[PDB]
């Protein structure tokens, strides 16, 4: 259990692309799939903000892409209604839906329907 503090000195780092923050928090045990009071994690905070390093290291470092936060959403949805097509065609390369007929959970289709994204995030499915 981190404090609500440290999280947003690693979701900071994130933010801004501080990938030797990120790496140096991660080396020292610090929990990479934490979750805010928002149920945002740091590898959403680096999707919204653009930041592809730090999403690639993040992953890297074994972050879980399909952790959602409080209203539903993933580091995929994110990149979606940032446009951030880059990144979400490194997330969607692993389905958080597969299962979705099961879990009734929202999925990254029906989120880029409501925003008009739907053939951009086909486009970037995996073959």
């Given at each position: 259990n981190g404090s609500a503090e440290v999280i947003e000195l690693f979701f900071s780092a994130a933010k801004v692309g501080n990938i030797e923050v990120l790496q140096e928090f991660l080396s020292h045990?610090?929990?990479?799939d934490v979750q805010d009071h928002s149920g945002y994690t740091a590898l959403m905070m680096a999707s919204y903000y653009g930041q592809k390093d730090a999403v690639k290291v993040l992953l890297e470092q074994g972050?879980?892409?399909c952790l959602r936060d409080?209203?539903?959403?993933?580091a995929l949805m994110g990149a979606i209604v940032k446009a951030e097509w880059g990144i979400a065609k490194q997330l969607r390369?692993?389905?958080?839906?597969?299962n979705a007929a099961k879990t009734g959970l929202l999925t990254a289709e029906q989120f880029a329907i409501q925003f008009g994204q739907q053939q951009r995030l086909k486009d970037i499915q995996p073959s």
């Amino acid at each position: 259990n981190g404090s609500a503090e440290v999280i947003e000195l690693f979701f900071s780092a994130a933010k801004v692309g501080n990938i030797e923050v990120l790496q140096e928090f991660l080396s020292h045990g610090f929990p990479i799939d934490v979750q805010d009071h928002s149920g945002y994690t740091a590898l959403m905070m680096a999707s919204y903000y653009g930041q592809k390093d730090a999403v690639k290291v993040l992953l890297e470092q074994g972050a879980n892409r399909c952790l959602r936060d409080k209203r539903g959403h993933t580091a995929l949805m994110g990149a979606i209604v940032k446009a951030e097509w880059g990144i979400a065609k490194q997330l969607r390369q692993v389905d958080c839906d597969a299962n979705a007929a099961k879990t009734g959970l929202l999925t990254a289709e029906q989120f880029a329907i409501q925003f008009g994204q739907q053939q951009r995030l086909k486009d970037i499915q995996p073959s």
